[PDB]
């Protein structure tokens, strides 16, 4: 499968833009998930991904401008393989763009960014999970961007609905599902002869009525017994222990908002914890002892609290072979798998490199066309350099005439 080409299949007829996606190759890495007392992390392995797409205000011409920047992490366990968002930013130039159509482009973008890395890293019998959170925020990627007068943002309600717009088509080429803990019919063998999946909204402080105001309207049209969106955490089909401690229940990702709350409870915990042979070591939290009460109180985070809002999503894909009710099981030992690399980007950096590609991008100014301009050449030019490669990247044409 090629990028470039998927994007060109469903990006509007005439609009041109250019891409550079860099990928770092897979090592290893913290787990997502915590491991509970007397066993070691699942050993899991970490890959990079980062796409910049840019327009060329003036065909012809060297002169690029980036307008939308994405940052894609895929983690991979022997169990399960995580897709997640961890930056998404535009730069506010996109109006440059001589004839662009009025469907968000930049939903087109990321929608056919993450069904490429869904594709190119699903793996023959595994759970595969795409996740994000959602929230309006001072995102790394372009900084000064936002003195741009062109540059509009959305606010928390608005980026969450987005968001589940840009995974709504994802979800939709799989079929329904029934019910993880529902009855077991004869959908068992339906639904493991295909590739299914269901999408998890939750949204601290919202109830299960308003959370499915932020679902899309194709939701409203889904039967009852095969509802596409679901206001809850897919607990069983991430954790093959549901009864172990809720610190190890919930995934850890970069500046995540629950993350963090996550952090701030672990320190609740004795020092002791971890120590060899230690009798603190139940791995419970003082003023939260479920998961059921870790969602409750994230609501009064600062992060979900005073007119703010976070939303979390999940959407799990169950591969042929697997429906949503087999458990996820453990791949933890009691105190290196294949991971094909057919998505990787242009240029495949090293850990180091990767880092100096995000940072020099960060350090660029975005505050006018002029230095914006300048920026896009410099990074490109950068990138170029990190990968041996005199020029990365590829354009590409809309091809979809609907």
């Given at each position: 499968?090629?990028?470039?080409?998927?994007?060109?299949?469903?990006?509007?007829?005439?609009?041109?833009?250019?891409?550079?996606?860099?990928?770092?190759?897979?090592?290893?890495?913290?787990?997502?998930?915590?491991?509970?007392?007397?066993?070691?992390?699942?050993?899991?392995?970490?890959?990079?991904?980062?796409?910049?797409?840019?327009?060329?205000?003036?065909?012809?011409?060297?002169?690029?401008?980036?307008?939308?920047?994405?940052?894609?992490?895929?983690?991979?366990?022997?169990?399960?393989?995580?897709?997640?968002?961890?930056?998404?930013?535009?730069?506010?130039?996109?109006?440059?763009?001589?004839?662009?159509?009025?469907?968000?482009?930049?939903?087109?973008?990321?929608?056919?960014?993450?069904?490429?890395?869904?594709?190119?890293?699903?793996?023959?019998?595994?759970?595969?999970?795409?996740?994000?959170?959602?929230?309006?925020?001072?995102?790394?990627?372009?900084?000064?961007?936002?003195?741009?007068?062109?540059?509009?943002?959305?606010?928390?309600?608005?980026?969450?609905?987005?968001?589940?717009?840009?995974?709504?088509?994802?979800?939709?080429?799989?079929?329904?599902?029934?019910?993880?803990?529902?009855?077991?019919?004869?959908?068992?063998?339906?639904?493991?002869?295909?590739?299914?999946?269901?999408?998890?909204?939750?949204?601290?402080?919202?109830?299960?009525?308003?959370?499915?105001?932020?679902?899309?309207?194709?939701?409203?049209?889904?039967?009852?017994?095969?509802?596409?969106?679901?206001?809850?955490?897919?607990?069983?089909?991430?954790?093959?222990?549901?009864?172990?401690?809720?610190?190890?229940?919930?995934?850890?990702?970069?500046?995540?908002?629950?993350?963090?709350?996550?952090?701030?409870?672990?320190?609740?915990?004795?020092?002791?914890?971890?120590?060899?042979?230690?009798?603190?070591?139940?791995?419970?939290?003082?003023?939260?002892?479920?998961?059921?009460?870790?969602?409750?109180?994230?609501?009064?985070?600062?992060?979900?609290?005073?007119?703010?809002?976070?939303?979390?999503?999940?959407?799990?894909?169950?591969?042929?072979?697997?429906?949503?009710?087999?458990?996820?099981?453990?791949?933890?030992?009691?105190?290196?798998?294949?991971?094909?690399?057919?998505?990787?980007?242009?240029?495949?950096?090293?850990?180091?490199?990767?880092?100096?590609?995000?940072?020099?991008?960060?350090?660029?100014?975005?505050?006018?066309?002029?230095?914006?301009?300048?920026?896009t050449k410099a990074w490109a030019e950068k990138v170029?350099?990190?990968?041996?490669?005199?020029?990365?990247?590829?354009?590409?044409?809309?091809?979809?005439?609907?």
């Amino acid at each position: 499968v090629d990028l470039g080409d998927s994007l060109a299949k469903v990006l509007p007829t005439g609009v041109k833009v250019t891409i550079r996606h860099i990928s770092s190759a897979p090592s290893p890495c913290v787990a997502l998930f915590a491991a509970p007392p007397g066993e070691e992390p699942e050993s899991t392995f970490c890959e990079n991904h980062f796409l910049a797409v840019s327009i060329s205000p003036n065909e012809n011409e060297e002169s690029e401008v980036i307008i939308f920047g994405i940052e894609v992490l895929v983690y991979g366990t022997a169990h399960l393989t995580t897709i997640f968002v961890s930056k998404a930013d535009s730069t506010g130039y996109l109006h440059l763009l001589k004839n662009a159509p009025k469907v968000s482009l930049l939903r087109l973008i990321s929608n056919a960014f993450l069904s490429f890395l869904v594709q190119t890293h699903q793996r023959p019998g595994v759970r595969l999970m795409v996740s994000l959170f959602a929230r309006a925020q001072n995102q790394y990627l372009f900084p000064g961007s936002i003195e741009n007068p062109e540059k509009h943002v959305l606010d928390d309600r608005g980026l969450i609905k987005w968001w589940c717009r840009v995974i709504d088509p994802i979800l939709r080429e799989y079929e329904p599902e029934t019910g993880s803990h529902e009855k077991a019919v004869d959908d068992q063998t339906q639904e493991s002869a295909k590739s299914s999946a269901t999408a998890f909204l939750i949204v601290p402080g919202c109830d299960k009525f308003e959370t499915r105001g932020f679902f899309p309207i194709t939701a409203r049209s889904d039967g009852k017994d095969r509802p596409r969106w679901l206001n809850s955490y897919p607990l069983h089909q991430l954790c093959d222990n549901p009864n172990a401690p809720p610190r190890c229940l919930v995934p850890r990702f970069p500046d995540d908002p629950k993350t963090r709350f996550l952090i701030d409870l672990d320190d609740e915990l004795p020092e002791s914890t971890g120590a060899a042979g230690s009798k603190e070591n139940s791995g419970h939290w003082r003023s939260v002892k479920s998961l059921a009460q870790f969602w409750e109180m994230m609501s009064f985070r600062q992060e979900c609290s005073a007119g703010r809002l976070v939303g979390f999503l999940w959407l799990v894909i169950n591969p042929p072979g697997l429906v949503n009710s087999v458990q996820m099981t453990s791949s933890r030992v009691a105190s290196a798998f294949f991971w094909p690399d057919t998505g990787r980007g242009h240029a495949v950096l090293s850990e180091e490199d990767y880092k100096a590609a995000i940072n020099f991008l960060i350090d660029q100014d975005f505050n006018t066309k002029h230095k914006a301009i300048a920026s896009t050449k410099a990074w490109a030019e950068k990138v170029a350099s990190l990968a041996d490669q005199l020029w990365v990247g590829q354009r590409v044409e809309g091809r979809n005439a609907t």
